[PDB]
Structure 1
């Protein structure tokens, strides 16, 4: 009828509709997957994930200029996709680096991030030979120096910058004094003080400048300002140390935050266009200050891992709730909740939800997809439409849950993690099995 259309910018590349009207991913009907693997279920469309890997890499000239941000979603299978498609991998803590290593990720294609890197983390990284570390404090620079000098290597590093730009969807805020934990201020001199300290020692070596300015960005405008303010530092450093000790700072890392479509109306720019533009503004901005254009590096998380995966639920309860003297809201309770998708409660995110186990001829009715936790705020999709005949047993899917949902998953109310499955050219396979009661108790020490 009208809730039937599956906006292609929102749903995985390989979504189709059955002859019996069952939504399918990679040739497999979602009903099949719920019978085989249970619900709730995370369903990853592997070709989608790889596709986006490939489209981004082409857009920026090389998969090497594209670092996947592990925090969006990480496991061995994914580390292995990243590796195969030739991108780099951005890990953020000791734990992330471990997993990437356990999955035999090339450690020269790993960059390590973080505002509070411990000593053991910095050690373990040069020990495996990570080969970029984006430093975030004077203290980390001191530690990294000792540690690296001790190992008899020269660690390539980037310094993380605050340029006071914060971008989201179609706007951005600029501030005199960015008030957050990451990076070093350009304007207050802290960043230049750091650039010096890194020049003072022989055990580190500054190879670029990093800036991360937001998420869910749909415009290039904020990157342009951010890039201007970053290249501005570059100017300052060749102005104090002359183009020679500086020739080797040839990378500008503009971070991630490249947005995706959670809702049909969401209109992030095709990656190719976006990339062409950024490349232009990096080249205009560096030339208009007397400097050879540096290479552009970005760090996508979501824009790779997000659209390809969907979360499949089973309707359990359907309750009509009166919200005014005339109007109602259809609360449809589902298999999971803030345990596998906290994004709605935590960031006020908005998702798209659809009936997938069949096609309904019933009219659209206003609705709330909620979960099963004992908390009124356990809402998965705050505002949507649902066919009037939605009923227990039906299966629904929430789109674009591949980034940030599982990584943030918890065991609230002792609800185990859902299973994760990948589907590819007709074939599904369990990647991350579903937690069980034994898992829930595994930490308990008798």
Structure 2
């Protein structure tokens, strides 16, 4: 169906196959059938208003890390009682705004945050439902930037301090602790660290209840990685089974905060070839690191597939930006290409456009959705949009 597409839309652009988002979400809803669970899509992976509306129709929840995300979610149709707010740096304005929006709960990451929420809750005359994120100091075995479960990391808190915080929330007349939460990392290929984390948190949860803390939710976060380089992926059945066994004796609603595993595969970066250059061969395309930062930021490798039917040789697929970090794949192996040919960077649905910038003064890309039925979900940015907010200062 590519022909009609390239005739009506200029490259480069993000193209999303919506069914895969629906199917991926649905696989999470059924993984936990014999139990009460809540799947909160992590907006950070991709907050496009349209994909959120799709998830909202499937009654998805939302794991937000900012007021901006909470608003996107509400605007897309996600129910406030299915929204959870995490974040080690929530500002008083975000805290206050969250409380007035009646979301499920604020997942606190510091004792000082807990007190800040109490002070605001009290002034608003409401009892804030809150969850406490614990750092189980477990190595998720992943990229350091994507690793968040070690004492080293700024996320959550130790068992000792957690117990102290829960008790404090219990005593407060403006705090209602109702959930325990953890998230050891992202793009995880090993299910063991996850299970080990669930066991440790389940142990403290059992202890928390024995102390009167009335828990109702057990949040495991997200973290399941995708097959970027054809690696084996943690199966949901094995994931859900491991968690249910870790929760023996605890009658709690399980919450999952998957992001990448919901949208990664459904999104592809369609970019056109501009030139071919040569002892090494460089294939210059019109998309750049400003559009897709994963490769440079995490040395990630996404598959590149030629869409235009067409001698194979090694070559670095590079974008137009002035930096050496602006190269999608080193020594990729592709046939000889010519100006205008089209290629697709695979599995860019997560942390693709959500981390894109306008570096080198390049407008944010057009985003298209496929629904059996091509339509635009984000209009391309005009050149003037780049400096719109700088004109009055000129």
Segments of 4+ moved more than 6 angstroms: 173-177
Alpha-carbon contact 2:64-2:86 (below 8 Å) kept? yes
Alpha-carbon contact 2:148-2:183 (below 8 Å) kept? no
For the residue of structure 2 that corresponds to 1:215, the secondary structure is: coil
Alpha-carbon contact 1:160-1:209 (below 8 Å) kept? yes
Distance 1:337 1:143, change over 3 A: same
User: Among residues 370, 373, 379, which one is paired with 2:321 in the alignment?
Assistant: 373
- Aligned match of 2:121: 148
- Aligned match of 2:220: 254
Aligned pair 1:274/2:236, yes or no? no
Task: Work out the CA distance in 1 between the residues paired with 2:258 and 2:149.
Answer: 27
- Aligned match of 2:391: 445
For the residue of structure 1 that corresponds to 2:223, the secondary structure is: coil
- Aligned match of 1:87: 60
| Equivalent residues in 2 for 1:235-384, closer than 5 Å | 235-239=206-210, 241=211, 245-246=212-213, 248-263=214-229, 265-283=230-248, 291-320=249-278, 322=279, 329-358=280-309, 360=310, 362=311, 364-384=312-332
Distance 1:346 1:228, change over 3 A: same
Aligned pair 1:45/2:17, yes or no? yes
Task: Work out the CA distance in 1 between the residues paired with 2:147 and 2:222.
Answer: 18
Alpha-carbon contact 1:350-1:382 (below 8 Å) kept? no
What is the deviation of 1:336?
A: 1.2
Aligned pair 1:403/2:346, yes or no? no
* Structure (1 or 2) with the larger CA radius of gyration: 1
Number of positions where the alignment pairs a residue of Structure 1 with one of Structure 2: 390
Task: Work out the CA distance in 1 between the residues paired with 2:227 and 2:205.
Answer: 34
Distance 1:170 1:345, change over 3 A: closer
Aligned pair 1:424/2:371, yes or no? yes
Alpha-carbon contact 2:17-2:370 (below 8 Å) kept? yes
Distance 1:174 1:233, change over 3 A: farther
Distance 1:59 1:408, change over 3 A: same
Distance 1:279 1:367, change over 3 A: farther
Alpha-carbon contact 1:220-1:278 (below 8 Å) kept? no
Alpha-carbon contact 1:64-1:86 (below 8 Å) kept? no
User: Among residues 95, 119, 130, which one is paired with 1:122 in the alignment?
Assistant: 95
What is the deviation of 1:293?
A: 4.2
- Aligned match of 2:30: 58
Task: Work out the CA distance in 2 between the residues paired with 1:177 and 1:221.
Answer: 15
What is the deviation of 1:64?
A: 4.8
Aligned pair 1:393/2:365, yes or no? no
Instruction: Note the alpha carbon deviations across 1:344-383, whole angstroms, 9 max, x for none.
Output: 000110110011021x3x3x31121110001121112234
Distance 1:92 1:224, change over 3 A: same
User: Among residues 58, 61, 77, which one is paired with 2:50 in the alignment?
Assistant: 77
Structure 1 residue runs of 5 or longer lacking an equivalent are 1-28, 284-290, 323-328
Distance 1:144 1:412, change over 3 A: same
Deviates more, 1:141-150 or 1:201-210: 141-150
TM-score (norm 1): 0.83
Distance 1:177 1:356, change over 3 A: closer
What is the deviation of 1:196?
A: 1.4
For the residue of structure 2 that corresponds to 1:209, the secondary structure is: strand
Q: CA RMSD in A?
A: 2.2
